[PDB]
Amino acid sequence: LWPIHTHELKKVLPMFLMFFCITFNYTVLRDTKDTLIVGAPGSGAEAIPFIKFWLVVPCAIIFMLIYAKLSNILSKQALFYAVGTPFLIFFALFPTVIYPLRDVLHPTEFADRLQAILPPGLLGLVAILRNWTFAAFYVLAELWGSVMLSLMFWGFANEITKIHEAKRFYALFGIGANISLLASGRAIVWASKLRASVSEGVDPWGISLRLLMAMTIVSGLVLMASYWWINKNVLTDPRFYNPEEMQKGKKGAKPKMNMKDSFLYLARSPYILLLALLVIAYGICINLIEVTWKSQLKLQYPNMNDYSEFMGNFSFWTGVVSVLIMLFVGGNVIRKFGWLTGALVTPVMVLLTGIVFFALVIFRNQASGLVAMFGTTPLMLAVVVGAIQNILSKSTKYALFDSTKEMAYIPLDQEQKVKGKAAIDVVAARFGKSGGALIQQGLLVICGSIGAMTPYLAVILLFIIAIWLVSATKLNKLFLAQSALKEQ
């Protein structure tokens, strides 16, 4: 689609370019960080739940504090530059300085001397210390995705966009995110399949990493250039933007509740409680399967080039399925089949594509022999099923799960509406991710490996989807009742 007028073009094209560059970098780094962490020497998918908690969220709080104290000393555009340019500096220094020195910075000797002491479940924790530059890459990719996408760009947009433009501009950005998924997938596939220079002695992944980070640097430079252009040619034009507009809404400056003044609001009434249960269950269910799926990827694609090429193809097909969804099942299913079915499609889809995946992962030897008669191994079949599950979730999230969340936010009174919305999006925004990481950390420490914890992940996934299904079924009763009295 292209639902933007002709006069708003000069304002939206720099915005669309900024969003395209930011999402392109986000996808490239999201795939490259998994490639680096999972394919590292002495590392694997077990390092992912340890990073995502013991490095991502403390660095997240550190960066949020630095940003909050920096916004008061720098101007808005100077703040954007001072936050975005360190990212580009790191992504230019990584493949040129930090990755070539990865056999000098990484303390492999101390790392294995430590691993010989810690329990075998802390292999994912000693893989952080063994690959601490790859861990810094993971942290900074997560911080790109958080800061430069959700905080920086979206604050810029919500500040400079008009309310009468916001819906169309955000729909255009939603379709541009899928177009950038397509582009970043093709670019990662190309940079990975560029396993050229047959003359050995060079790192085949070194060239791919140089190409990926070079595309990232060019995209970040185009981002900075479009930001400068929209500041010097648009945000100073009294026709597109005027700071006399958002002051009305900023009179009541955003009162972000800390954690627990909302943890009690999640206990005020069963409505917001069940909605928080839905969000938390989604956040945990999406994370529970990803670590096992990435272990299966490390098994199927040992070297970093094939892993990154699969991640590129996976991003490309996530983009394809996202475009198909946004074009066909955009707002169809919710209004066609009620709120309960729209809220239940995602849990039952995760349930089906997760029990199949965990059956292929647990019953490998039982399946290898029946699947072998179909040309594939249960490892490749589990990889495919996990990729299908991830694609379906990341595709019909924005159209099936978020669309039912916000639809449930409707029949509430404005006070409880905004307060409970803030409560959910302040606690369960990570609570789910951090909990899905902590569950996997505990299961790795207790069980001892990823292959040994997968029978317990399936039981936990069934115990959470059961909560997800029962809470969505109960929330549908309080959603249908309150909607009827709101009519009169």
Add this chain to the structure above:
Amino acid sequence: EVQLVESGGGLVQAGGSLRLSCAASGFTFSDTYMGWFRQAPGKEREFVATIDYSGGHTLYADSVKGRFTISRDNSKNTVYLQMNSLNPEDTAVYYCAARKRYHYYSYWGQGTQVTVSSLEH
């Protein structure tokens, strides 16, 4: 009806070679997915190799990859399995399996027994 029968089993030595046969009958051989399995006494039946429909796609077990090669002949109805560099771990009764083009269950032959320089009895 779906009679499968194997041939070529026996013994050579630890590191020898054998060529199994699957001279089947009773179905459209050009439209069936064949393959070879084995079941040592006390172990579970594992697969050795499968041949797609014409020889394009072959899937070997990671324990026999590079050593064994599976080949069919849609004209001369028979599935072959050229076994080379036989290890003492290879001793088992080898079954030939056959799945139709759209079915989901594989028919099994009576299986031929293969033994190689019996290891420590």
